[PDB]
Design a protein around this ligand. Structure first.
Ligand code: H98
Lengths: 344, 211, 293, 204
């Protein structure tokens, strides 16, 4: 296998992280396990400290005219890498044990355990004119050297190896999304059934979505157009809970349903980024600068847990709405993310 | 710049139920993103291994991939008759992706003497105005057989086309045809045309223009 | 007494600071951010001050009369109100931007666009011209007082005299309204900043530094501009009651804001490094082979 | 699960062509369509790729500019508009797919569409016998090279060695079909482009 080894500007610190992307199981998040190769002769007085900080960048500026930092550490853990502390001792994994053998005694292992119910690696799409670091949650194992944690972290000794906490699709398929909204107009005084539904709940990125819109308009009023919008709701709860909506795919069909008539159409849509790159504030998946960033994967939150979680929590729902001579609307939620890569 | 992938061997000889190994070195430090494909004569390529360590779903398990830094390796424990085809290595890490030069794998058999023959241009070719002599090498292995032309006992290195035939499944032997095209005027200037074949001592066969 | 050195000092300060800020924002691609272009219009507005306004103003003050030109007197005056109104509105715009960022950072990403920010500063320059140039072209600012009419008729006289209506209208639309928006926006920013620091709580030091930064940028602006518009409000009610030498002294105190804006609003490390360079890394992620089991 | 390409035919240098590739069993957004050409007797050479999910149009250094790759989402079809053609572009273009999330080789490959590029126009299969323990038939001055030589209308299928067509400096293909016999040997050369059936008897 291979191990990603990012080195510090000076070159003394080199963190050997086995993988830059860690599968996110809602039941038990995987550990960020690695070893830091340092020279025992160098920094004889200081102590190598590694920290896995989940910095949520809400502003695209490291510093501004006011001096306020525009990055909040939602989850920051500090473990003493060298010298090994008896209290911080952890059972070395197969990856860590193999790395220490290859590197030798000069290398010291470090392990982390990301608590569950945390935001995944999501990046707010910066516009084409935007200049600066992309916003969103990003995990990074900053390996620095300092006598204490509160001491200024010199960038020459730091190792900012940004990683991504990606969440793939579950092995079990979800229930068929189904939602029906009936609106009764005062003048018409008759129901307007909109029994739209999806073929499946788990959709792979780039896979077409088939919305079986089944309209049964019994009211005298007729629908002029059928607008299906795949609204991406980013539940950002950093300071104040706010659901930011961004349409990633809109289909406005000029299909009219005469009064006292039924309708049934399977609209095929596909959430893609090629057209949504102009959209500002869109939540994209958190990937490395080299790898291409796709649409943010739907965060699978723990059932029966806190509804508010700091960071970006994207949720996709197709909004099948019919405009009438007010308008009817119904939201069918669905989870959009990649499947677990098969390994053997 | 373009990361050219140097693949070797250019032509690997093996037998059924044998172990083969194909090496592919990248000009730059490419990551594990190095696929391996199988290209049969006429048919389309087939993705054997992806990521240089993961076999594609639906391919035989005998194939295997191993990385040694920048020299990627595709190993086949026991190659079957269907495994006799070209192999290519592409680096989809950096664009533009660059494929390999190819490694044609054929059946290995006992070395056999080459059947060398010469055929001058018929009367029809002489009248057409563009005469051409040809030399045929039948039932010879391996394909690495050099042919030299001698229009007047002088080595010719121009206006000569060489064609190689795919290894037939009957005898697993190769066939080569070297055609030297000359004008009606230059053709008559030379008297005896000969073909010298060098392939596993060299044999020279000559035939005078006038019978 | 000499006015060349006293006037040259501030002149060199404004031109030097602004040229340095403009050069740092242009040459350096990292500084070409969204919040920086707001300061580029402030520095651009402050540059025109030290280039055309401050030099002509200093001469008129110590010489005693305006001998450059009859129409140039009104042109220089209109350009002065334009730059001041533009500088004040720019300080209020960037303040609103910091509020939109600190309070609603996620909405600020999509709401505040580079092209939109360019339109914002363009509208700021437009409203300032409507308050400065439009009245000058129509002479609406000219007062009907006897001393005011005498000064206008005299080509040499160029004292800034305005009527009650225009004086109040300009004072409320140019300084007081942006002032109320600025003080209110900064108060909300300070409250929200403390809440963010409390939620997060090296940590307290940065908080105190940010809180101190906010105070100095607001105190320097107030202490410089408030006195000028404060005495002007009384001058409008009683022109003869207020003195001319004090009106000029406070007007120069207001120009000091534009003079200190480049060094006060660009104190961030990104701007300090660019200034040091004008006055004069991240290692790629590799990989190693792990011995297979 | 199946990629079928079409639109590859004979074109002269500097012409225009539109190679189409229809997909079945997979959408163009979830997987990027790639085009790789393999010249006769040469290795594969990536031509261009299209990522509909990202709208990225990647071209090779030597092929960039002259080629234009596009994709129709409504018909899940890929198009490779070709302009300013050159003789080097003569190859068997293949239309394959790559997983967008994430790139893992090229799973499925198309059958291929031979697109020859040469200035020489269609010509007849000029046959020439070849005799002295073997006889042969040499076909010359023909383009393209789908020629198929059969001995005695395919009756003599033993010892026959049909060599592949080789491109000449003039741009016309040529191949020789030789049969081995110690000791009345008709040779039928069929050219479909020209619709010709040349029959000749090879003798000493
Ligand atoms: C009496 O002696 C004098 C002579 C000249 C001046 C300079 C004045 C043009 N600067 C004006 C200043 O630049 C400014 C800025 C913004 C404004 O809205 C207004 N208008 C006030 O009514 C004025 C001052 C006093």
């Amino acid at each position: 296998t291979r191990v990603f080894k990012k080195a510090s500007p000076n070159g003394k610190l080199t963190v050997y992280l086995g993988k830059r992307d860690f599968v996110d199981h809602i039941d038990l998040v995987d550990p960020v396990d690695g070893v830091v190769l340092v020279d025992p002769e160098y920094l004889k007085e200081r102590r190598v400290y590694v920290t896995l900080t989940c910095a949520f960048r809400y502003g695209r500026e490291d510093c501004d005219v006011l001096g306020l930092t525009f990055r909040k550490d939602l989850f920051v853990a500090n473990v003493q890498s060298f010298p090994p502390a008896p209290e911080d001792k952890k059972p070395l994994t197969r990856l860590q044990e193999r790395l220490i053998k290859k590197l030798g005694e000069h290398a010291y292992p470090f392990t982390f355990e990301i608590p569950p119910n945390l935001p995944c690696s999501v990046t707010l799409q910066p516009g084409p004119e935007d200049t600066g670091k992309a916003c969103g949650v990003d995990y990074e194992v900053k390996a620095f050297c300092a006598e204490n944690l509160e001491e200024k972290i010199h960038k020459r000794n730091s190792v900012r190896l940004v990683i991504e906490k990606v969440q793939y699709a579950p092995e079990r398929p979800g229930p068929q999304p189904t939602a029906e909204t009936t609106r009764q107009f005062l003048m018409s005084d008759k129901p307007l059934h909109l029994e739209a539904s999806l073929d499946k709940e788990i959709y792979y990125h780039g896979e077409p979505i088939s919305v079986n819109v089944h309209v049964t308009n019994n009211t005298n009023k007729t629908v002029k157009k059928i607008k299906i919008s795949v609204r991406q709701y980013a539940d950002i709860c950093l300071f104040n809970t706010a659901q930011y909506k961004c349409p990633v795919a809109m289909e406005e069909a000029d299909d009219t349903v005469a009064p006292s008539s039924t309708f049934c159409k399977v609209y095929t849509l596909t959430p893609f980024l090629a057209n949504n790159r102009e959209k500002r504030g869109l939540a994209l998946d958190g990937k490395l600068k080299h790898e291409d960033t796709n649409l943010a994967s739907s965060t699978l939150l723990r059932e029966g847990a806190n509804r508010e979680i700091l960071g970006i929590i994207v949720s996709y729902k197709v909004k099948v709405k019919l405009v009438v001579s007010s308008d009817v609307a119904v939201e069918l939620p669905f989870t959009l993310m990649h499947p677990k890569p098969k390994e053997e | 710049s373009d990361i050219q992938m140097t693949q070797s061997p250019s032509s690997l000889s093996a037998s059924v139920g044998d172990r083969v190994t194909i090496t592919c070195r990248a000009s730059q430090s490419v990551s594990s993103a190095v696929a391996w494909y199988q290209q049969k004569p006429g048919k389309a390529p087939k993705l054997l291994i992806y990521s240089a360590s993961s076999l594609y779903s639906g391919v035989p398990s005998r194939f295997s991939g191993s990385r040694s830094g920048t020299d990627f390796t595709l190993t086949i424990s026991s190659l079957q008759p269907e495994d006799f085809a070209t192999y290519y290595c592409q680096q989809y890490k950096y664009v533009p992706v660059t494929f390999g030069q190819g490694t044609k794998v054929e059946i290995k058999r006992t070395v056999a003497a080459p059947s060398v023959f010469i055929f001058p241009p018929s009367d029809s070719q002489l009248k057409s105005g563009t005469a051409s002599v040809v030399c045929l090498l039948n039932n010879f292995y391996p394909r690495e057989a050099k042919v030299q032309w001698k229009v007047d006992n002088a080595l010719q290195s121009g206006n000569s086309q060489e064609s190689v035939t795919e290894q037939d499944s009957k005898d697993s032997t190769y066939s080569l045809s070297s055609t030297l095209t000359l004008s009606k005027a230059d053709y008559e200037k030379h008297k005896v045309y000969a073909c010298e074949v060098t392939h596993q001592s060299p044999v020279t066969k000559s035939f005078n223009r006038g019978e | 007494a000499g006015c060349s050195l006293l006037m040259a000092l501030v002149v060199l300060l404004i031109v030097a600071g602004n040229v340095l800020v403009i050069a740092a924002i242009g040459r350096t691609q990292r500084l070409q951010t969204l919040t920086n272009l707001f300061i580029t219009s402030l520095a651009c507005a402050d540059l025109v001050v030290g280039l055309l306004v401050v030099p002509f103003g200093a001469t008129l003050v110590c010489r005693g009369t305006w001998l450059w030109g009859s129409f140039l007197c009104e042109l220089w005056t209109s350009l002065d109100v334009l730059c001041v109104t533009a500088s004040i509105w720019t300080l209020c715009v960037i303040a609103i931007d910091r509020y939109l960022a600190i309070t609603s950072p996620f909405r600020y990403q999509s709401l505040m666009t580079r092209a939109r920010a360019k339109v914002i500063i363009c509208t700021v320059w437009a409203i300032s011209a409507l308050v400065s140039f439009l009245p000058i072209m129509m002479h609406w600012w000219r007062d009907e007082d006897p001393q005011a009419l005498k000064c206008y008729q005299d080509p040499g006289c160029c004292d800034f005299v305005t009527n009650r209506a225009y004086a109040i209208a300009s004072s409320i639309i140019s300084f007081y309204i942006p002032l109320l928006i600025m003080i209110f926006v900064y108060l909300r920013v300070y409250r929200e900043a403390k809440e963010q620091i409390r939620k997060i709580d090296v940590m307290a030091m940065r908080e105190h530094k940010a809180l101190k930064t906010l105070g100095i940028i607001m105190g320097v602006f107030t202490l410089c501009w408030l006195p000028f518009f404060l005495v002007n409000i009384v001058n409008v009610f009683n022109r003869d009651l207020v003195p001319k030498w004090l009106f000029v002294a406070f007007n120069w105190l207001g120009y000091a804001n534009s003079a200190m804006n480049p060094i006060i609003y660009c104190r961030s490390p990104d701007f300090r490094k660019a200034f040091k360079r004008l006055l004069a890394e991240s290692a790629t992620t590799a990989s190693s082979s792990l011995a297979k089991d | 699960v199946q990629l079928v390409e079409s639109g590859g035919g004979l074109v002269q240098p500097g012409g225009s062509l539109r190679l189409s590739c229809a997909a079945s069993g997979f959408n163009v957004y979830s997987s990027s369509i790639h085009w790789v050409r393999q010249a006769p007797g040469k290795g594969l050479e990536w031509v261009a790729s299209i990522s509909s999910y990202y709208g990225y149009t990647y071209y090779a250094d030597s092929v960039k500019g002259r080629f234009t790759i596009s994709a129709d989402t409504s018909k899940n079809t890929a198009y490779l508009q070709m302009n300013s053609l050159r003789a080097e572009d003569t190859a068997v273009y293949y239309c394959a797919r790559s997983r967008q999330f994430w790139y893992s080789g090229l799973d499925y490959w198309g059958q291929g569409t031979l697109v020859t590029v040469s200035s020489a126009s269609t010509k007849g299969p000029s046959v020439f016998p070849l005799a002295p323990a073997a006889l042969g038939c040499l076909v010359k001055d023909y383009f393209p090279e789908p020629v198929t030589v059969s001995w005695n209308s395919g009756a003599l299928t033993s010892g026959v060695h049909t060599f592949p067509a080789v491109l000449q400096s003039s741009g016309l293909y040529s191949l020789s079909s030789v049969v081995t016999v110690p000791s009345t040997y008709i040779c039928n050369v069929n050219h479909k482009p020209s619709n010709t059936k040349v029959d000749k008897k090879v003798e000493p």
